[PDB]
């Protein structure tokens, strides 16, 4: 009967990288999802299956809040059925997604003169990601057929590159903070209702 | 497979290159908007970090065989990587070359020419000699600045340039190109399929052809200007010979724009100058660029980004910021577009603003392409897309519906001819100049012009192709071509030739899409969504396609047509012909302004030809010129009681033949303009003709003077 700790997810000091995206479990609390959807701080708030409008009068077992950082051009890839370096190798959503995708421009908090490079992303992977799968490995990627033997060189590249977030970039290259809410409905207590 | 290897290789290169140049572009923008010494360092560091990475990625891309790759867009990306910017040279011959390039730039930037009667008033090129050659109607003054800028600075470049083509060839041959010219012409070498590919030698053949189709319109403009310049230089221009190379409105004759006050068809009617209306209406920098932004968006293009407005430099600043501000359009990268320009409220800077934003519009369209394909189709597309916008905006129609022209303003045909000519002196006068220059360099890089023929062949093509003659003869101590910024700074020059053809191809095409009826020079693309969509479709492909196709889906022709240019100038072409009915059309290759005062000498063939014991060389020519100077020295002292210290530097040899014949005239010691009249030089020779035949062992039928 308490209020769900969304201020931990949204108002966090630093966000996680997209390859190493974070997940917060939310249970046994009351959530007013109409504050999120009626906030003017966000650039994207898209939902799938459920309806944004006045559906904080539902119940669920667990609510999952994924959070990470990407550049503006890559926000389109956080959606069911999308392809790209992010949706294939960093964060994949299922076709039958029951949740919402929230985003907002973070050029003020994640861009630095000289460039902030702490935010990383995966550039190569042997296969695509299953929905909600996370790959935090750092294995040298084999593109050729000579064995890389855990060292980068010709046809052997380090899989993670670094976002070059400068404050003077265009909007498509500016950083965006993303929160993906996931609603779970098990034959189970259904603890997070929300009036 | 070897395509995946290169697909993932480019994936990583893109991820690193994008930010490696952006930090480099930022570092050079910090400098150009605040000149300091910290910013020169922060620039050079990021530039080195970028160059080193580009070398690394050009080597690592070299071992990616192009033969076995069945995709075209990834083919072109590797091509750029392998072709450009490799090492093929030793560390010593590369260091040696870098020193030569900096020396040539420094000498050109810092050189100066002093005055004949005040050697402490030495004058740089900018802005001292620029202002003289562009505004002076004094023959002798321009001759001093012209010749002075070729003897004090050009001669310094001849040894450096000789070494510069050698190291460029030696480098270009290592890239598996024929010459350094071959390496330059690679930019036009496409791959096409569904068709035949454009080759590097096809550019030379198309460029020769286009000149021959321009020759008619040029010959008439060259003839009309010659007849007009005769009014202000009555006794210096022959009505049938070539044009003195120092009277063309600047140092080299690259443009004839500064000849308009002397060649204006109808002076009583001024040309349209909007500047006063802009001022009285209170226009500022912002109003100019917003009106350019309004123009582009009126053509269904995108408006600028608030990153462009909040970060570009539209005006010269406050608090003593030294800024190189000569208009440029920066695509820094990462969607960061800016314009650096010290704009003023004038009409000139009003057109230039539309030209710069024209570059930004091109930059925004192909931003969706991979880093290596974010560029114009060929080296002539950018500066042509820039100038086509300037064409349609400078029209009286556009200014009329802007509030800068009275609705009661009339457009009569007398001013149209004034405008057409003001354009032709700039657009058409430069085309023969631009064509013979690149031809000369192509011929020098190929080796078809020995170093002992450089200036001989350089001016033969000047009198033949451009129809301009040097005011004083230059031997191989000069490097007159290197007197131009582009030649002494290792930049291509055909890009100004091709851009002019592509410009009017684009113009004639878009004015047909915009259903424009009437003469072509009165066209205007504003408020035409049809014409803007087809334009953005060409700007968006960037460099990812054959420029033949990219040009084919705008103007409906795979090839380079100068037709639209001549079609644009037909009103002036038919007016020039009627205005040339009473004067000569063409030029006389052999005439020169020093010719009639020269004296023809005939070297004795003491044995038939090629017996090289005798048959005089450069050193005998010095002895001959010093012997002439003595005769001139002796003459004036013994006949006029004057101490005039002639020298070998005051005896000018022209019409040189291979140890067979030549001409020569004499000038006052510290004044190149005043030539000693020929009858006096003939007398000075007679007085000492026995003294000149002795030194060369000739006997007055061997050494003859034709008069
Ligand atoms: Zn430009």
CSV table of C-alpha atoms in Angstrom, one decimal, chain A residues 29-160:
chain,number,residue,atom,x,y,z
A,29,UNK,CA,3.4,-1.2,-4.0
A,30,UNK,CA,0.8,1.2,-5.4
A,31,UNK,CA,1.7,2.9,-8.7
A,32,UNK,CA,-0.1,5.9,-10.3
A,33,UNK,CA,1.0,5.4,-13.9
A,34,UNK,CA,-0.8,8.6,-14.8
A,35,UNK,CA,2.0,10.7,-13.4
A,36,UNK,CA,4.5,9.2,-15.9
A,37,UNK,CA,2.2,9.5,-18.9
A,38,UNK,CA,1.1,13.0,-18.0
A,39,UNK,CA,4.6,14.3,-17.4
A,40,UNK,CA,6.0,16.9,-19.9
A,41,UNK,CA,9.7,15.9,-19.2
A,42,UNK,CA,9.6,13.0,-21.7
A,43,UNK,CA,10.1,13.0,-25.5
A,44,UNK,CA,8.8,9.5,-26.0
A,45,UNK,CA,6.1,7.6,-24.1
A,46,UNK,CA,4.8,4.7,-26.2
A,47,UNK,CA,2.8,1.7,-24.9
A,48,UNK,CA,2.0,-1.7,-26.5
A,49,UNK,CA,-1.0,-3.8,-25.7
A,50,UNK,CA,-1.9,-1.9,-22.6
A,51,UNK,CA,-3.3,1.6,-23.0
A,52,UNK,CA,-1.6,4.7,-21.4
A,53,UNK,CA,-5.0,6.3,-20.7
A,54,UNK,CA,-6.3,5.6,-17.2
A,55,UNK,CA,-5.0,2.0,-17.0
A,56,UNK,CA,-3.5,2.6,-13.6
A,57,UNK,CA,-6.7,0.8,-12.5
A,58,UNK,CA,-5.1,-2.6,-13.3
A,59,UNK,CA,-3.3,-5.2,-11.3
A,60,UNK,CA,-0.1,-7.1,-12.0
A,61,UNK,CA,2.3,-9.6,-10.3
A,62,UNK,CA,5.6,-7.8,-11.0
A,63,UNK,CA,6.5,-4.6,-12.8
A,64,UNK,CA,10.0,-4.5,-14.3
A,65,UNK,CA,11.7,-1.1,-15.1
A,66,UNK,CA,14.7,-1.4,-17.5
A,67,UNK,CA,16.9,1.6,-17.9
A,68,UNK,CA,19.9,2.5,-20.2
A,69,UNK,CA,21.2,5.2,-22.4
A,70,UNK,CA,21.4,5.5,-26.2
A,71,UNK,CA,21.6,8.3,-28.9
A,72,UNK,CA,18.5,9.8,-30.4
A,73,UNK,CA,18.7,7.9,-33.7
A,74,UNK,CA,18.5,4.6,-31.8
A,75,UNK,CA,15.3,5.4,-29.8
A,76,UNK,CA,13.2,4.0,-32.6
A,77,UNK,CA,14.8,0.6,-32.1
A,78,UNK,CA,13.3,0.2,-28.6
A,79,UNK,CA,10.1,-1.3,-29.9
A,80,UNK,CA,8.8,-4.7,-30.9
A,81,UNK,CA,10.1,-6.0,-34.2
A,82,UNK,CA,12.8,-3.4,-34.8
A,83,UNK,CA,16.3,-4.2,-36.2
A,84,UNK,CA,19.6,-2.4,-35.7
A,85,UNK,CA,22.8,-2.4,-33.6
A,86,UNK,CA,20.8,-1.8,-30.5
A,87,UNK,CA,17.8,-4.0,-31.0
A,88,UNK,CA,19.9,-6.9,-32.3
A,89,UNK,CA,22.9,-6.8,-30.0
A,90,UNK,CA,22.1,-4.7,-26.9
A,91,UNK,CA,18.3,-4.7,-26.0
A,92,UNK,CA,15.7,-6.7,-27.8
A,93,UNK,CA,11.9,-6.5,-27.2
A,94,UNK,CA,9.5,-9.4,-28.0
A,95,UNK,CA,6.8,-9.1,-30.7
A,96,UNK,CA,4.2,-9.7,-27.9
A,97,UNK,CA,5.5,-6.9,-25.7
A,98,UNK,CA,3.2,-5.9,-22.8
A,99,UNK,CA,4.6,-2.7,-21.5
A,100,UNK,CA,5.7,0.9,-22.3
A,101,UNK,CA,8.8,2.6,-23.7
A,102,UNK,CA,9.7,6.0,-22.1
A,103,UNK,CA,12.5,8.3,-23.1
A,104,UNK,CA,13.8,11.8,-22.7
A,105,UNK,CA,16.7,13.9,-23.9
A,106,UNK,CA,19.7,13.8,-21.5
A,107,UNK,CA,22.2,16.1,-23.3
A,108,UNK,CA,22.3,18.2,-20.1
A,109,UNK,CA,23.3,15.4,-17.8
A,110,UNK,CA,25.3,13.0,-20.1
A,111,UNK,CA,27.2,15.3,-22.5
A,112,UNK,CA,30.6,16.8,-21.5
A,113,UNK,CA,33.0,19.2,-23.2
A,114,UNK,CA,35.7,17.1,-24.6
A,115,UNK,CA,33.2,14.3,-24.7
A,116,UNK,CA,31.6,11.8,-22.3
A,117,UNK,CA,32.6,8.3,-23.4
A,118,UNK,CA,31.5,6.2,-20.3
A,119,UNK,CA,28.4,5.0,-22.2
A,120,UNK,CA,29.1,2.0,-24.3
A,121,UNK,CA,27.3,-0.2,-26.7
A,122,UNK,CA,27.8,-3.6,-28.5
A,123,UNK,CA,28.9,-3.4,-32.1
A,124,UNK,CA,29.4,-7.1,-33.0
A,125,UNK,CA,27.7,-10.3,-31.9
A,126,UNK,CA,27.7,-13.8,-33.3
A,127,UNK,CA,23.9,-13.9,-33.2
A,128,UNK,CA,21.0,-11.6,-32.2
A,129,UNK,CA,19.6,-11.3,-28.7
A,130,UNK,CA,16.5,-13.1,-27.4
A,131,UNK,CA,13.9,-10.8,-25.9
A,132,UNK,CA,15.1,-9.2,-22.6
A,133,UNK,CA,18.5,-11.0,-22.9
A,134,UNK,CA,21.6,-9.2,-21.6
A,135,UNK,CA,25.2,-9.9,-22.9
A,136,UNK,CA,27.9,-8.3,-20.7
A,137,UNK,CA,30.7,-10.4,-22.1
A,138,UNK,CA,33.9,-8.8,-23.4
A,139,UNK,CA,35.2,-11.6,-25.6
A,140,UNK,CA,37.2,-10.4,-28.6
A,141,UNK,CA,34.9,-10.8,-31.6
A,142,UNK,CA,35.9,-13.1,-34.4
A,143,UNK,CA,34.9,-11.8,-37.8
A,144,UNK,CA,37.4,-13.9,-39.9
A,145,UNK,CA,38.4,-17.5,-39.5
A,146,UNK,CA,41.8,-17.1,-37.9
A,147,UNK,CA,41.5,-17.7,-34.1
A,148,UNK,CA,41.5,-14.4,-32.3
A,149,UNK,CA,42.8,-16.0,-29.1
A,150,UNK,CA,41.5,-13.2,-26.9
A,151,UNK,CA,43.3,-10.3,-28.5
A,152,UNK,CA,42.1,-7.7,-31.0
A,153,UNK,CA,43.7,-7.3,-34.4
A,154,UNK,CA,43.0,-7.9,-38.0
A,155,UNK,CA,39.5,-9.4,-38.4
A,156,UNK,CA,39.4,-9.5,-34.5
A,157,UNK,CA,37.7,-6.6,-32.9
A,158,UNK,CA,36.8,-5.6,-29.3
A,159,UNK,CA,32.9,-5.9,-29.3
A,160,UNK,CA,32.1,-2.8,-27.3
